[PDB]
RNA sequence: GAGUGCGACACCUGAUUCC
DNA sequence: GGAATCAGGTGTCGCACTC
């Protein structure tokens, strides 16, 4: 389920009441629950909005209208995966959302990839990339390790990667807003001068933004796909996160380390 | 030692909808 | 009994940064 902002929750509630919806007793941690005919809408205090009952089409459209009314388009959301994992690639993804893309993300109930299973992520990423334009920078470990040699700091590397993608996408698409996770204290500073006239937002919990969340899903799916390829390529079994790393280091032939791991890590 | 942000991974428990 | 959605919480492992 997607996450509504504070203003959207309030505007959605008013809108649904204004066309007759009946308030019902909300479940634990929910803000409100409305019935419209036989369709149920539940909005959690977190902002997550959940459809229930039957004939959910009218509810879905009303939510879409609400989110569309206060979301400036076109916009870009930016996110990375594989940053803190010793094994496998670093992936930076940016998604450009126009109206058709935004409506799609809403329909899909898109949210932060951290809250999604692997199968859900792969499924959603293909739905996303079928509708939205975007750009992905993939750094498999062999490439990552070379890039890291020049930067000697992951934030500096991330800055360079984001700066290039965002600059190119802004020149091409000229969005009204650019939103990105605060991945370093210097990220705003680096991105400020490549976004042209767009409003730039660098902030924590950036995945509350639909386009940022869509980007987290794409970046994560690219990582998962690459992890599988690395496994078949080097005939090795790999953990998606940081588990069993000391043993994995010993098990893995030394000449494959630069091809599988982020060597600068101390694990 | 304690935090913040980013990246995760692995679990527990409760609620809701539909069949 | 099955599919799914949400929420509150626990632990572990990394890079960067602050006190
Ligand atoms: Mg991410």
Residue numbers in the entry: 0 to 266
What do the study authors state?
Here, we describe the structure of RNase H3 from T. ammonificans complexed with an RNA/DNA hybrid. The best crystals were obtained for Ta-RNase H3 in complex with a 19-mer RNA/DNA and diffracted X-rays to 2.1 Å resolution. In the structure, both domains interact with the RNA/DNA substrate, and the protein covers a continuous stretch of 15 bp of the hybrid. 2′-OH groups of four ribonucleotides, two on each side of the scissile phosphate, interact with the protein, leading to RNA-specific binding: ribonucleotide 5 interacts with the backbone carbonyl of Lys181, ribonucleotide 6 interacts with Glu79, and ribonucleotides 7 and 8 interact with the side chain of Glu84. The scissile phosphate is located at the active site of the enzyme composed of four carboxylates: Asp78 (replaced in the crystallized protein with Asn to inactivate the enzyme), Glu79, Asp180 and Glu206. One metal ion, refined as Mg2+, is observed at the active site, corresponding to metal ion A. It exhibits regular octahedral coordination with six ligands: pro-Sp non-bridging oxygen of the phosphate group of nt 7, pro-Rp oxygen of nt 8, backbone carbonyl of Gly79, side chain of Asn78 and two water molecules. Importantly, the deformation of the substrate 1 nt from the scissile phosphate is observed in RNase H3, which is also a characteristic feature of RNase H2. Our structure explains this by showing that a phosphate group of the DNA strand that is located across the minor groove from the scissile phosphate is bound tightly by the protein, leading to deformation of the non-cleaved strand, which is only allowed for DNA. Therefore, the structure implies that by combining the interactions with the 2′-OH and stacking of aromatic rings with deoxyriboses of the DNA, a relatively small N-domain can achieve specific binding of an RNA/DNA hybrid. In summary, our structure completes the picture of the mechanism of RNases H. RNase H3 represents a notable example of conversion of the substrate specificity from RNA–DNA junction recognition to RNA/DNA hybrid cleavage.
